[PDB]
Each structure stands twice: as C-alpha cells, then as structure tokens.
C-alpha cells in the first residue's frame, strides 16, 4: 500500500484486543519528538508519546478512550530542537476559523465509479462543463451566509441538471484560509473546507450531484506548496515536503505518494470524477528552465490514476504551449486527457471585442482553432479567470448599446457550442451577469427578478445549446477527429460569415452558419455535401432569447447550382449577429 498513504497515515479507528481507541501515525523521519496532543489528553504533551519507526519515517501511537468528534493535534520537538504543534496533513476534517486542530473522523466508505459516469468523460461524450466557486454561487438573501454543501445540494444541483450541464466544476474545496485565495492557497489537502458543513455533507452533495446525473470535477492543486498557518513548511526543523518561492519536492518519493494518494482519495472517497489542475507551467518551468520532477510526477500520477481508476480523468491548464499535454506519455506526452484551450478563450474574446465593422480584418481569429485542433483534446474555457481583475464580464467586453452586446453574446455562445472541443463555462456567465465575478458575494440574481428580460434570454439559449448538443452525435461525437468537423466557407472575410459541418461516426451532418455582423444575409448560398430537405435546430437570434425572430422560416432545399467547389448547395437567411445549426430531414 505504497498508492494509498491516507489510508495508514494520520488518525484511524483501530481495536487493541478488545478495547477501541484511534491509531495516530505522522511521517517525520528527524523530529525526535513526537507525542499526541488533543481532547483525549487535555492537550498534555507528556501524556501520550508516540514511537519512531525509524525504517519508514513514522511516528506511531495508538490511544484507548480517543474516538470521532475530538480534536487534535501533535506536538513536536524539531530536529533542531524546537516546540511546534504540527496539524496533521492527513487530516481529514479541520477545525473551524480560526483554529487548526485536526478532527477525528477517519475515512468515507469507497464509492464505485459507475459505468455511466465512466461513459460521461469519454472522448466521444457531450461535455458541457458548469464551472463553480462554492463560496460565491449564491448567498441566503436576508444574512447574506454561504449555502452549506447540503443546500447546494437542493439548488445548484437542480440548476445544473436543468440548465443541461453534464459536469460541475469545482474550484478547490480543500481546507483553505483565506476566502480571497479561492481554494488555491490550501492548507489541508485531505480535508473539504468546514465553510460548507462537514466531510460528510460534503460527500452528501457529490452522491446528490450524481443521482442528478452530473459528473464532479474537482480543482486540484498540487502545484500549490502551502503558504499559511505554517501549514507544511519545515515540517520537522528540515525541509520535509519542500525543496530547498516554496516548491514541492516531487522527487522525493514519500511527498509524490502524499501527493497521488490524495488524487486517489478524492476520487476514491468521494466519487469524484475527474480532477483539474491549474497552472501547469508553474509546476514544469521555472534542463534549462524544466523541472524535471515535477514533469516527471505528473506523468507518473495521470499513469497511476489510469492504472488505478480506470474512468476518472484528469484535465489541464498549461500557459506555454509545452507539447502533447493531452498526450500518451510514451510519446512525448503529460498523459493528461483534456487539456483547456487558451489560445482559442483569447482569440475569440479578441474577435468579439472588436467593432463588427473591423471583424473583416481578423477573421483569423475565428479559423486557427482548427489548425492545432487535433494537437490536443481541447476544452473550450470560458472560466473564472477571465471575469475577474478589471478583464470585465464576458457581456460587457461586447461592443454596441446594450442590444447589441446581447446580440453579440448570444452568437458567441452559438459558434462556441457548435467549434470542436467540450465546453467550460463560469457561474454567472449563463445568464450574462454584467458586473465582474465577486468572490465575496452571491451572483448577480437580481438580473433575472422580474419580467422576463434579456438576460432571461442568455439563459434560456445556453440551456437550449447544452440540451441541443447533447442530443445530436454530430455536436461531440468527433470533436478529435479530422472526419468530425469540415469547412463549407472560411474565407468569406469581407462579410465576416462562417460556415461550418459537424459530423457523426454514421455520417450524418450539422451545417453551423455565424454572421458576425449587424448586416442580415439574404439568399446567401453556399456549397453543402448532402442535398436534400434542411432545418434550423438552433437560431440565437430566435424571439425566444429576444432576438429580432429572422431565419429561414422552415424547410429549405438544397439545389443543384454549383458553389464553393460543390456541385449542391443552400441558400439561407443568416441573421444579422447570429449563428444558426441546421439538420437534414430524412425523406
Ligand atoms: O438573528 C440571527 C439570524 O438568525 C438566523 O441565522 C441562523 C441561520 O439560519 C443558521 O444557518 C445558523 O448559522 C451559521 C451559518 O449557517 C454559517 O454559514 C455561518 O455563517 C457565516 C456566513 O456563512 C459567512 O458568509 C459569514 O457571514 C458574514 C456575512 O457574509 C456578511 O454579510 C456579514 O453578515 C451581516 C449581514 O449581512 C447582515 O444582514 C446582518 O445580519 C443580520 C440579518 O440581517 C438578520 O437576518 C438576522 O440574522 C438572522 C438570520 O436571518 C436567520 O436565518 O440578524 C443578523 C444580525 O447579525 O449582520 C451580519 C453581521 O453579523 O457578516 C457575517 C459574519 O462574518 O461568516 C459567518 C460566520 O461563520 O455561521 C452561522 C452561525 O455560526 O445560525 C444562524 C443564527 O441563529
Ligand atoms: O497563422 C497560421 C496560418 O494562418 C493563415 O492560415 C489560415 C488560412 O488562410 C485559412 O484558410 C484557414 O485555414 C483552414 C483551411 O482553409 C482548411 O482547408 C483547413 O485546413 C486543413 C488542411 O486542408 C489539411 O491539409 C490539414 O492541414 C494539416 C497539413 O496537412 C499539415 O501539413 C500540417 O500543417 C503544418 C504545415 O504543413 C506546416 O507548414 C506548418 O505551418 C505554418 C504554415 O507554413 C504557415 O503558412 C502559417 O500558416 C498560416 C497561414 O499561412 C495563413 O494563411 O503558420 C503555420 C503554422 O501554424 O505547420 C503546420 C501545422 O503543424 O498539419 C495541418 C493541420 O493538421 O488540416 C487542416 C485543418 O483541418 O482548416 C484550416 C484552419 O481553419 O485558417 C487558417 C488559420 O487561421
């Protein structure tokens, strides 16, 4: 059990004989040292002392009497001879602000990963990504608390589940102090945040989340070296977990197993389904500039998570087009399964920013994707990041009154939905919220108070998207391969139109047209492979979402003129600011 340290590490049930007590075990291999401290002692350091194991590191103790529900902690002597309570990095539930002492609980029973939760992170599954901070969702209104685990249970779940997402993305919900950190700065790797409720209503949430059918991905941070409380620095008077601005030792061999033990306990424990890592470039840059060990620890944990966990996935933020981060490690490859495309979230948003007059110019922005599409297996993100620091809401980076800012947004969402790659998109951005993400308050629900309004619009549109990309293979199905996505016009720069098929194993085509204009298109014919009846399954511009109701108005055929190259094509109304899907009938 070298995988698995949680489950020897730290505070356990055990029984002696015949009377039951918790076994303490800390991995300090110097500290000469070590006793347990806690309610079981009246925190008295002579009281209870722990025994060396000095072939593994371990300091080990067992405690009649000591049991679920107590507080503790371990009292160390350095090995340079210095008295500091240690929090135990194993804990599994810490005590509320401010405080520190570890909590006694032991482990959740294991859950099993499904077959259909296996199935929902495949390569050829709709993923549809809801991106949340648990802190800031949404706040009771007349107090303004947080909504506990089990709350959220009742009301992001369903949300979730409606709005037609098939994941929920977790910002990190390890022990944390700071609210400003987001979850980023950690603490305590193994415990859920005490924010929220228990380990156990924590856990209540994930089991809620899957009987709704929604996958978990969690934020995990093990880029992030601890930085507060004296959480981990010079565990033991040396320099136990970092290197000698603080960095994991990933070399070291006890620090990677606390490290991949930990991914194993999430998805393990907790029936989390897939984990995200931030920051890739931080962990593998500053051989020249590359860490090699942690290089080399990132392929090892995505190896044994695909060894041990066979459904769980992980995903990928890298800033410095480092290669083949979602790629087979016996290659030159990170081993990850997705990784977030930046470089697509930053040439969209720079496309959509510019005045529609000038989009003629850049119509680069919108085709590149495609060009290293099949170079990685991409998420497209449109996450918390990019809403916060004066970057402004995504509505708000819009140009034009407001009308046109919807306009524009609504037609976004429709070609993001329809490029290849799964879909990320941050709480808030749904529904259009127009002031920049707050970590310290609710979302801006007040938006949708009232009669129904534009940013009632944005919401149902990002629903209708989710539930229409879900149903048809052609969506999702191929987003990693050639055959899954074909150009039917993509030089029409002067008119800034683009026209794209997405493609099923069988087939079968979805024709996706975008006018990023204000300028409507009449009869406006293209080149398509299969003639035949067409239809609109998706129009941002519908009356449904308060758009101005053009489109094609029901059934169009093809005919047998010539253009682009191909001998059939359509001639369609494109909205102006618009993107439309359309199906072929069968007959
Ligand atoms: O009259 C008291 C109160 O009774 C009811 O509240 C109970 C509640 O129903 C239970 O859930 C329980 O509470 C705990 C809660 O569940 C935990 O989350 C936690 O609370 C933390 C918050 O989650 C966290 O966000 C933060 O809270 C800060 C707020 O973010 C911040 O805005 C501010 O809060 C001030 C309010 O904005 C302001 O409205 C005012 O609050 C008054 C309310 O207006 C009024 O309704 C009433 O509160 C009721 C409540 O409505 C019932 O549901 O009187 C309030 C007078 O205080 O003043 C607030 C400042 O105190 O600051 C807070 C604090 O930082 O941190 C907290 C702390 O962790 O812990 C909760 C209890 O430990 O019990 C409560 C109480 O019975
Ligand atoms: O800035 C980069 C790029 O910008 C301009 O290119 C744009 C172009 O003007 C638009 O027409 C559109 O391009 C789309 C194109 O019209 C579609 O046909 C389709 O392209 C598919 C190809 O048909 C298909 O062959 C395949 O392409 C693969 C190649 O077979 C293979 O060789 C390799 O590509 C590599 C090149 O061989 C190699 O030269 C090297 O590339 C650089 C170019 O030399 C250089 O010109 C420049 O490209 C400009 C271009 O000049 C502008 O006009 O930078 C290139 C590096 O980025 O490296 C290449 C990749 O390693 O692999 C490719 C891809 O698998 O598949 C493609 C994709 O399905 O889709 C096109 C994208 O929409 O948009 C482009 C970009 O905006």
Redesign the pocket.
């Known amino acids: 059990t070298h995988l698995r340290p949680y489950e020897t590490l730290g505070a356990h049930a055990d029984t002696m004989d015949g009377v039951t007590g918790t076994r303490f075990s800390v991995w300090a291999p110097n500290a000469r040292r070590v006793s347990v401290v806690g309610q079981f002692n009246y925190w008295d350091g002579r009281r209870h002392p722990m025994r060396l194991r000095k072939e593994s590191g371990i300091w080990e103790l067992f405690i009649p009497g000591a049991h679920n529900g107590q507080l503790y902690k371990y009292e160390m002597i350095d090995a340079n001879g210095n008295l500091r309570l240690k929090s135990d990095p194993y804990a599994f539930e810490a005590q509320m602000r401010p405080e520190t002492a570890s909590l006694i609980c032991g482990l959740p029973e294991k859950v099993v990963q499904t077959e259909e939760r296996k199935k929902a992170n495949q390569f050829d599954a709709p993923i549809s990504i809801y991106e949340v901070h648990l802190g800031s969702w949404r706040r009771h209104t007349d107090n303004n608390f947080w909504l506990s685990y089990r709350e959220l249970a009742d009301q992001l779940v369903p949300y979730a589940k409606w709005m037609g997402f098939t994941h929920l993305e977790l910002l990190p919900i390890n022990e944390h102090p700071f609210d400003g950190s987001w979850g980023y700065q950690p603490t305590g790797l193994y415990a859920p945040t005490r924010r929220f409720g228990t380990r156990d209503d924590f856990r209540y949430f994930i089991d809620a989340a899957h009987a709704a059918g929604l996958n978990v991905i969690l934020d995990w941070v093990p880029g992030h070296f601890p930085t507060d409380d004296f959480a981990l620095a010079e565990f033991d008077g040396t320099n136990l977990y970092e290197h000698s601005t603080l960095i994991y030792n990933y070399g070291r061999r006890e620090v990677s197993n606390f490290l991949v033990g930990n991914a194993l306990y999430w998805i393990e424990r907790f029936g989390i389904d897939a984990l995200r890592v931030d920051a890739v470039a931080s962990m593998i840059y500053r051989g020249g500039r590359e860490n090699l060990e942690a290089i080399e620890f990132l392929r090892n944990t995505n190896r044994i998570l695909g060894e041990q966990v066979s459904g769980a996935v992980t995903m990928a933020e890298e800033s410095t087009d480092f290669p083949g981060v979602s790629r087979p490690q016996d290659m030159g490859g990170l081993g990850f399964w997705y990784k977030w495309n930046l470089g697509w979230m930053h040439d969209t948003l720079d496309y959509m920013k510019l005045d529609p007059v000038y989009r003629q110019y850049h119509?680069?922005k919108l085709?590149?994707?495609?060009?290293?599409?099949?170079?990685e297996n991409f998420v497209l993100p449109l996450s918390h990041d990019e809403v916060v620091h004066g970057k402004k809401s995504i509505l708000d980076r819009m140009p034009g009154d407001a009308w046109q800012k919807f306009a524009n947004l609504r037609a976004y969402y429709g070609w993001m939905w329809a490029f290849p790659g799964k879909k990320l998109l941050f709480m808030g951005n749904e529904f259009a919220q127009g002031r920049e993400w707050n970590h310290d308050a609710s979302l801006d629900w007040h938006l949708l108070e009232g009669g129904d309004n534009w940013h009632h619009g944005v919401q149902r549109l990002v629903r209708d998207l989710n539930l229409t990309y879900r149903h048809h293979k052609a969506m999702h199905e191929l987003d990693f391969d050639?055959y899954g996505?074909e150009?039917l016009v993509?030089?029409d720069k002067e008119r800034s139109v683009l026209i794209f098929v997405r493609r099923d194993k069988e087939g079968n085509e979805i024709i996706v047209a975008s006018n990023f204009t204000p300028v409507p298109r009449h009869d406006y014919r293209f080149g398509i492979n299969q003639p035949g009846k067409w239809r609109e399954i998706l129009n941002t511009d519908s009356m449904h979402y308060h758009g101005s109701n053009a489109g094609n108005g029901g059934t169009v055929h093809s005919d047998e003129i010539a253009s682009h190259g191909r001998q059939h094509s359509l001639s369609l109304t494109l909205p102006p600011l618009a993107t439309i899907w359309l199906v072929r009938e069968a007959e």
């Open positions: 119509h680069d085709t590149f994707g495609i060009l290293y599409n099949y170079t050639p996505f150009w993509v030089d």
